Write an enzyme that holds these catalytic residues in place. Structure first.
Site, short mmCIF file in Angstrom:
data_model
loop_
_atom_site.label_atom_id
_atom_site.label_comp_id
_atom_site.label_asym_id
_atom_site.label_seq_id
_atom_site.Cartn_x
_atom_site.Cartn_y
_atom_site.Cartn_z
N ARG A 1 -84.51 -3.62 -42.68
CA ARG A 1 -84.32 -2.34 -43.10
C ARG A 1 -85.36 -1.54 -43.82
O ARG A 1 -85.82 -0.51 -43.04
CB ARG A 1 -83.24 -2.34 -44.17
CG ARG A 1 -81.63 -2.66 -43.55
CD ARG A 1 -80.98 -3.26 -44.89
NE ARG A 1 -81.29 -4.75 -44.83
CZ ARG A 1 -80.98 -5.52 -43.51
NH1 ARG A 1 -79.95 -5.20 -42.87
NH2 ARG A 1 -81.33 -6.63 -43.88
N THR A 2 -86.17 -1.85 -44.58
CA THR A 2 -87.26 -1.25 -45.23
C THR A 2 -88.22 -0.76 -44.25
O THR A 2 -88.72 0.36 -44.38
CB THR A 2 -87.72 -2.14 -46.43
OG1 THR A 2 -86.69 -2.33 -47.24
CG2 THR A 2 -88.60 -1.03 -47.24
N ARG B 1 -95.49 -3.92 -47.79
CA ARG B 1 -94.48 -4.70 -48.24
C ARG B 1 -95.50 -6.01 -48.59
O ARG B 1 -96.29 -6.42 -47.59
CB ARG B 1 -93.68 -5.21 -47.67
CG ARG B 1 -92.74 -6.55 -47.73
CD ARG B 1 -91.32 -6.22 -48.53
NE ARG B 1 -90.22 -6.25 -47.65
CZ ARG B 1 -89.04 -5.78 -47.86
NH1 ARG B 1 -88.55 -4.96 -48.93
NH2 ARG B 1 -88.06 -6.17 -47.24
N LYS C 1 -109.39 -13.94 -40.35
CA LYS C 1 -110.86 -14.34 -40.51
C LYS C 1 -111.14 -14.38 -42.06
O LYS C 1 -112.17 -14.25 -42.66
CB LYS C 1 -111.73 -13.00 -40.17
CG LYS C 1 -111.29 -12.85 -38.49
CD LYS C 1 -112.11 -11.55 -38.11
CE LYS C 1 -111.39 -10.90 -36.75
NZ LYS C 1 -111.44 -11.68 -36.04
N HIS D 1 -88.93 -2.72 -56.49
CA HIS D 1 -88.46 -2.26 -55.18
C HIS D 1 -87.93 -0.68 -55.31
O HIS D 1 -86.70 -0.57 -55.22
CB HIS D 1 -87.34 -3.05 -54.39
CG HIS D 1 -87.20 -2.93 -52.83
ND1 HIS D 1 -87.84 -1.98 -52.14
CD2 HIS D 1 -86.17 -3.71 -52.25
CE1 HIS D 1 -87.41 -2.25 -51.07
NE2 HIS D 1 -86.17 -3.26 -50.96
#
Ligand SMILES: Nc1ncnc2c1ncn2[C@@H]1O[C@H](COP(=O)(O)OP(=O)(O)OP(=O)(O)O)[C@@H](O)[C@H]1O
Ligand SMILES: [Zn+2]
Ligand SMILES: [Zn+2]
EC number: 2.1.3.2
Lengths: 310, 146, 310, 146, 310
Positions: free
Chosen positions: E54-55, E105, E84, E134
């Site tokens: 969703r997000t 996120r 790296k 959130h």
């Protein structure tokens, strides 16, 4: 022949006060007077399908110290059970046609009873079947308890730790419930509390038991303080809150301890008995470990000899 | 300047800087006795020194010796009731147990509950330390780590 | 009792020329006249927490060839140290109450000295503690060197390979530095050069040593050419440039070798001694391996017997 | 005085055992001027106190704010030409930066090049410190777990 | 200029009742009248270092529907950070010299506030940082609550689940505490209870909250029932007793519910809401998920446009 000849030794619940007493007297005899040829020409299998130091090596040194030959395995991986997939029942069936007695350690509860069905006439000695029984341990703990407190009746015994999966405390609570007026103090977390059936059996015999939240609560009263290890390998994921021993014992605690009190641990010990306890008069667990040699060769000698040793 | 004491030990003539290092390395501050440290005191004999007075505490010959590893010129003065009863000076201890850790990453001392011990050896510039367990020798500079 | 009775054998640095000479004479006696019951009724633990073929099996055959019983393990995984997390110190503490002597191989440097503290009265024989010492190896190499060159003093010895982690060359350079006028040639890569403390000790005794970049440089001069394996398992990631042996020895090289020169390798051998060397008069390493039986049973016999064997 | 400096700071009324941690925390040993440390001196109302005396040296802001969170009892005395020019008891600041380490193991502060920062809510029970990054608020007891 | 132009949308605590209401009014407007090129010629980064359906997808579709281009990554595995060893601080520095806004996120708490110290002038929008905040979720839930109750004041809200590691309920309680007279009922396993710092804040504002052992005991009083998932990926091993949902909503429990009551869930949903709830007039979690497009279009519009006229 003596009472235990050719007998399987699978659980404490099938032995009498009489049997237990007999094994300990043979142990004290043997301790006093070694019999090096007592099992000359016998071959015993040491079948350990689970890890060990004490049980397996003390058992194999006891067999050698009576003249017997040892064959076996300490890992399942390289057996045909390990790699080729055969059933335990067939393992035991072929092994029975080679040795005179089978010492067996196995990770499922009931493995050694399963083996008696297929061993035909060969005695099976249980070295620990999962979290159920460990009768051999119980016999050397009773030898040590009698050796230090003089008696096995009317003792104060606190069992601390993981009583739910402690094969050691399951069998030892059943053995001391066969003697008069023994008092029990059980200090465990809830999740790893003493199994209900043990408690029912204690109630039937009118044995007094009491749960306690602290070592300090029982300290001044107890004769034997029996510490256990959280059976890490056996814990369900739910139980992973308690893996570190809630009850850890340091030397400080012994301030209000009775000068006869002994601290016993089946071992391995992880965090629960702090190294500073190892220099107190109370620490006896390494002594207990060595007393395994005598209790073990007394059991072997009774089970493979018709004639009671002197 | 510093203080007058009743009875105890005054470790005098500590090379400046090292005075604090001694108090941390040997647990000298872990006590209920009164201590008076003078860091960076004019000595003349040396430009600056440090000095440590511990009231009603005494050191043993091995303890005093242990100090040679950082401060060989220190005079550990023993005082019994305002009298200088003794003046001790640190010889190399033949072994130092418990305070130092082995730089040998794969030494057993790290994984087991035992105390360290290093054999001291005067080599040819600084002091060489032999670990009792893994038996490697290291410079005493190195054992004092980073 | 003879000089080594109940003694721990942890490092060459604690033995005298006298001790070393005594073990080798018992070895030559025993080689000449086997004593099969010499350790009848003794139980030894063979505790190997690291890999082996030679050391562990030659040790166990030596114990059997003197009548003794062997209990133990060759893998740590199935001990309670392996799976249940107990400390080595507690391992040794319970094992001490079962056997008469402990042979121990362990991956950390100082493990066998750690075990002497907890073994109480039981002798610990070091079978290799990490990259530190291997005193048992040194005793069979000295038996072979004396058996081929006649003497242990005034020999030319080149040690080729990984001198930094070579537990074998650390102890053998300390043993030959106890005899007169021995000359050393060290051929190693830089990264795996001979440890400094060995060199300091050599300087103190006025023992002449010299570094060389080639086998051909020392070939015409050397009596004993002692080849080693790059201790692969012990290399730091930085050292992985040199894992293949820089110095490999083929039969061709022996063209300008003294007709008494012996090529010795502690073994396993990987790329460094080319199979064609196995048919030259100079190849002695398999002989050296077998001489382990004698040197080992001579050590065991001294440590567990008060009376010097004849 | 009970000792004496022309210019400098004397940090008096330090709780027993805090003194030495303070010496270490504020890196006061990296100096060349006279220091007198009186460990475990009498202080009637609370018995044992520690006393640090740094000659010709004064504390920078941050240290005095830290001092508020480590030793609130303490009094910094600004001495200039033997005159106690000032005597100041610390008060808690708004924020503490770059010396506190966040109790939250999964905080971002641990893995990335950032100065930690904590907001100081003076709770009736104790000091609640809130991380700048993960926004968790902790007991100062927890945060100062040495 | 609108008050949200160029702001970082990190934690709910930094936004006021007014900013929230401004996003919702806009949201309702974009819902009524789509703006296909409102962010024409803007490139935005979608940086997801932790898993999302969703997000991530709602945001990327909101960006597309307003006419922006998107660049980013679904997992750090392929970035020069994940392979790296680049710091997140450097990762943000360079991405800020390429794009107009960064949506991210991340698994560790605080990574969004960290990112802003490095993004220079580019707005960072927090898509979820570990178990902390959130804010975008809260904004689409407030839009859904608005939408169904016609008020964001004087509701009866119940939060059921893992209130400890739920970033969604940590932001939602802080946001609703900015409105008048909202009542809260928290049903959680105690090991997964609401954080004391939200609780203190509620006590400080004089809001009413209560703890309950069941959903049926509060069902007839609630306006919104907010269900959450047990954050397995965030659970400490001690908390493994708490992985399967303690309180499961089944259609039969809603029998005494207010007709207006809405069952909300952030989603994913595992066993905590039986699919039979999906067919009731009370289930609103997919509508809520849909509402994410308007809330996220509204947020982006405001941050990147100095004045909106719609
Ligand atoms: N009873 C005491 N109380 C406090 N300090 C004392 C006492 N006795 C000695 N000291 C301290 O210990 C040190 C001893 O000084 P000492 O008695 O050796 O005279 P000295 O001229 O300083 O000789 P040296 O220069 O070799 O130390 C001095 O630093 C002094 O402060
Ligand atoms: Zn070491
Ligand atoms: Zn934090």
């Amino acid at each position: 022949a003596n009472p235990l000849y050719q007998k399987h030794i699978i659980s404490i619940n099938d032995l009498s006060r009489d049997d237990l007493n007999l094994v300990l007297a043979t142990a004290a005899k043997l301790k006093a007077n070694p019999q090096p040829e007592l099992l000359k020409h016998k071959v015993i299998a040491s079948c350990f399908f689970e890890a060990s130091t004490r049980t397996r090596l003390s058992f194999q040194t006891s067999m050698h110290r009576l003249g017997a030959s040892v064959v076996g395995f300490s890992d399942s991986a390289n057996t045909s059970l390990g790699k080729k997939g055969e059933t335990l029942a067939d393992t035991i069936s072929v092994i029975s046609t080679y040795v005179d007695a089978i010492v067996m350690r196995h990770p499922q509860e009931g493995a050694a009873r399963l083996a008696t069905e297929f061993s035909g006439n060969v005695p099976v000695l249980n070295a620990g079947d999962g979290s159920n029984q460990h009768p051999t341990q119980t016999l050397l703990d009773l030898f040590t308890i009698q050796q230090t407190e003089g008696r096995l009746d009317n003792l104060h015994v606190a069992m601390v730790g993981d009583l739910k999966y402690g094969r050691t405390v399951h069998s030892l609570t059943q053995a001391l419930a066969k003697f008069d007026g023994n008092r029990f103090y059980f200090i465990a977390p809830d999740a790893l509390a003493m199994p209900e059936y043990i408690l029912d059996m204690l109630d039937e015999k009118g044995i007094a038991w009491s749960l306690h939240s602290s070592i300090e609560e029982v300290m001044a009263e107890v004769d034997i303080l029996y510490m256990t290890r959280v059976q890490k390998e056996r814990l369900d994921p739910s139980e992973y809150a308690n893996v570190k021993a809630q009850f850890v014992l340091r030397a400080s605690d012994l301030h209000n301890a009775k000068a006869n009190m002994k601290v016993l641990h089946p071992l391995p010990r992880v965090d629960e008995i702090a190294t500073d306890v190892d220099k107190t008069p109370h620490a006896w667990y390494f002594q207990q470990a060595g007393n395994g040699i005598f209790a073990r060769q007394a059991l072997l000698a009774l089970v493979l000899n018709r004639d009671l040793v002197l | 300047g510093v203080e007058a004491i009743k009875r105890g030990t005054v470790i005098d003539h500590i090379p400046a800087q090292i005075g604090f290092k001694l108090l941390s390395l040997f647990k000298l501050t872990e006590t209920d006795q009164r201590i008076t440290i003078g860091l960076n005191l004019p000595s003349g004999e040396m430009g600056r020194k440090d000095l440590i007075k511990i009231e009603n505490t005494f050191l043993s010959e091995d303890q005093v010796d242990q100090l040679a590893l950082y401060a060989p010129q220190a005079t550990v003065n023993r005082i019994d009731n305002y009298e200088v009863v003794g003046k001790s000076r640190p010889s190399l201890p033949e072994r130092i147990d418990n305070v130092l850790v082995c730089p040998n990453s794969n030494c057993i001392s790290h994984a087991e509950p035992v105390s360290s011990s290093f054999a001291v050896r005067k080599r040819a510039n600084d002091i060489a330390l032999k670990c009792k367990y893994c038996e490697k020798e290291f410079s005493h500079n190195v054992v004092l780590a980073n």
